[PDB]
Amino acid sequence: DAEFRHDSGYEVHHQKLVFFAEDVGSNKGAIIGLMVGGVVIA
Amino acid sequence: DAEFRHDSGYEVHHQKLVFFAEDVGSNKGAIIGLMVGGVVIA
Amino acid sequence: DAEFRHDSGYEVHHQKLVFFAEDVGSNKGAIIGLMVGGVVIA
Amino acid sequence: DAEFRHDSGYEVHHQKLVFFAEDVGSNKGAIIGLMVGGVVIA
Amino acid sequence: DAEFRHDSGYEVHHQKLVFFAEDVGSNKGAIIGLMVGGVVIA
Amino acid sequence: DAEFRHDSGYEVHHQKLVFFAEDVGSNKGAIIGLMVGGVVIA
């Protein structure tokens, strides 16, 4: 008997690429990328 | 007996590439891309 | 009997790439990427 | 005085995505693509 | 006086994604891709 | 006076993604990718 109780709100379980989550102040250079050679933020 | 209880749905998995989620202040340079060589944000 | 009770608590994840979590002051150079050679933030 | 002497190397740069170069034996599964989820080779 | 003497050409430039170089025996599963979730080779 | 003599000895490589170099026996599972979750080779 396999009883899997998952009352969550997502379907990810491998790679989760996302910035923030709740609430931040100011995003002055928010970047999230693998092998990203080159990026300038004021 | 396979009882899978997932109160959410069936989509978005393996790779989740997306910025934000709830609500941020200001997106001054929000970028999310792998192998992205080149990007300038004021 | 396999009783898995997970009320929105995915602690065991593969790869979780995300900045912040609760709330910060100012994001002046928030970057999260593996093998990222090159990045300038004012 | 800017003297740039480049006998070769004027066509590709930044991102060089290509398989092989001189000569291999057998290509039984030669793949080169970023974010490529799904591929089966016998 | 800037004297740049570069005989050779193609070889590398920021990102060099390529398999092999001289000559191998057998390529039974040659793959080169970042963030590549999924690949089966016999 | 800047005398740069580079006949076959470059330094600006940044990212060099490539398998092998001289010559191997058998490539039964040759993979080169960052953040590659998932790969099976016989």
Side-chain angles (χ1 to χ4, degrees), chain A residues 3 14 16 18 26 28-29 41, chain C residues 2 4 15 17-18 27 30 40 42:
Chain A
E3 274 99 46
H14 250 255
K16 212 218 167 181
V18 49
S26 47
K28 187 61 118 264
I41 311 113
Chain C
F4 280 82
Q15 177 247 67
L17 262 64
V18 50
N27 327 326
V40 180

Side-chain angles (χ1 to χ4, degrees), chain C residues 12-34:
Chain C
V12 183
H13 56 238
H14 177 23
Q15 177 247 67
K16 212 218 167 181
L17 262 64
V18 50
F19 234 66
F20 321 109
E22 269 298 352
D23 166 55
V24 286
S26 47
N27 327 326
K28 187 61 118 264
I31 73 96
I32 173 164
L34 239 113

Side-chain angles (χ1 to χ4, degrees), chain E residues 4-40:
Chain E
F4 280 82
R5 258 97 129 160
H6 294 275
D7 244 310
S8 266
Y10 63 94
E11 48 122 37
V12 66
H13 213 297
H14 199 253
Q15 177 246 67
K16 212 218 167 181
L17 262 64
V18 49
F19 235 69
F20 321 110
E22 268 298 352
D23 166 55
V24 286
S26 47
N27 327 325
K28 187 61 118 264
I31 74 96
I32 174 164
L34 238 113
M35 200 244 268
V36 177
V39 56
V40 180

Side-chain angles (χ1 to χ4, degrees), chain C residues 35, chain E residues 31-36, chain F residues 17 19 31-37:
Chain C
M35 199 244 268
Chain E
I31 74 96
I32 174 164
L34 238 113
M35 200 244 268
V36 177
Chain F
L17 262 64
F19 234 65
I31 73 96
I32 173 164
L34 238 113
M35 199 244 268
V36 177

Side-chain angles (χ1 to χ4, degrees), chain B:
Chain B
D1 290 325
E3 274 100 46
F4 280 82
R5 258 97 129 160
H6 294 275
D7 300 84
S8 25
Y10 259 117
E11 50 147 36
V12 187
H13 71 140
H14 203 343
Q15 177 247 67
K16 212 218 167 181
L17 262 65
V18 51
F19 235 68
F20 320 111
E22 269 298 352
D23 166 55
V24 286
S26 47
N27 327 325
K28 188 62 118 264
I31 75 96
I32 174 164
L34 240 114
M35 198 244 268
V36 178
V39 56
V40 180
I41 311 113

